[PDB]
Coordinates of C-alpha atoms in Angstrom, one line a residue:
X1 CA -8.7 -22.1 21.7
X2 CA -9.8 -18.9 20.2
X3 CA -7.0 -16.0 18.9
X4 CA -5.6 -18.7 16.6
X5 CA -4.7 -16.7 13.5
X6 CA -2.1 -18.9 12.8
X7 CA -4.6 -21.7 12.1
X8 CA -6.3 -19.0 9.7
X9 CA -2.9 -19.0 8.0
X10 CA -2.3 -22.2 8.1
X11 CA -5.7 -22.7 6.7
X12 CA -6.0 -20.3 4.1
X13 CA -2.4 -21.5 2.3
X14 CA -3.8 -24.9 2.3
X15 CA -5.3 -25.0 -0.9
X16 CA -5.7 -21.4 -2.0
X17 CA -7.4 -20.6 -5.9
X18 CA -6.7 -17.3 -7.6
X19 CA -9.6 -15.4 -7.1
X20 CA -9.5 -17.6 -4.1
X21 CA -6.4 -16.4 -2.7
X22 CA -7.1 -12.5 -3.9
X23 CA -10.2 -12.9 -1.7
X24 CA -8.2 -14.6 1.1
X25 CA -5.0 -12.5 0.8
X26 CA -6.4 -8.9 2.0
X27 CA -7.6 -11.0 5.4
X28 CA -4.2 -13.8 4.7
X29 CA -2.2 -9.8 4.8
X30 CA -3.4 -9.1 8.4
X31 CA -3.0 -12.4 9.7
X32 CA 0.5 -12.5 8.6
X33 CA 1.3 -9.1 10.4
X34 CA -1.0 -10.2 13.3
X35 CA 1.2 -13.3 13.9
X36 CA 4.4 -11.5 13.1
X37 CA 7.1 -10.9 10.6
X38 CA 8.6 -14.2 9.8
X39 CA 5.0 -15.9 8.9
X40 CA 4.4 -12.4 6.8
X41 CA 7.5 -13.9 4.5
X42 CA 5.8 -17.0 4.2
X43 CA 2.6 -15.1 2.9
X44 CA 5.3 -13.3 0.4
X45 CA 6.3 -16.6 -0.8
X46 CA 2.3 -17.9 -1.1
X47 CA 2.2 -14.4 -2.9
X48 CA 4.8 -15.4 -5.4
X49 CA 3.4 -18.5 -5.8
X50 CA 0.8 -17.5 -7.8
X51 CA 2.4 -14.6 -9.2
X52 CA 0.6 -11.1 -7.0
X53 CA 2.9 -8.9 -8.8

């Protein structure tokens, strides 16, 4: 089924690099408030993960 951004989420904080999560985060950022609120915390926390500071 198509409109499933929260595969694309799910997806992207797999296994997500540095530059590879930079690259992924500006599209990771609209998925997150595309799916909602409580999945744009868990983007927060991949964020912090990494450091995005």
């Amino acid at each position: 089924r198509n409109l499933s951004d929260r595969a694309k989420f799910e997806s992207m904080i797999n296994s997500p690099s540095k530059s590879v999560f930079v690259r992924n985060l500006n599209e990771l950022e609209a998925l997150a408030v595309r799916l909602g609120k409580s999945y744009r915390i868990q983007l927060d926390q991949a964020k912090e993960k990494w450091k995005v500071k």
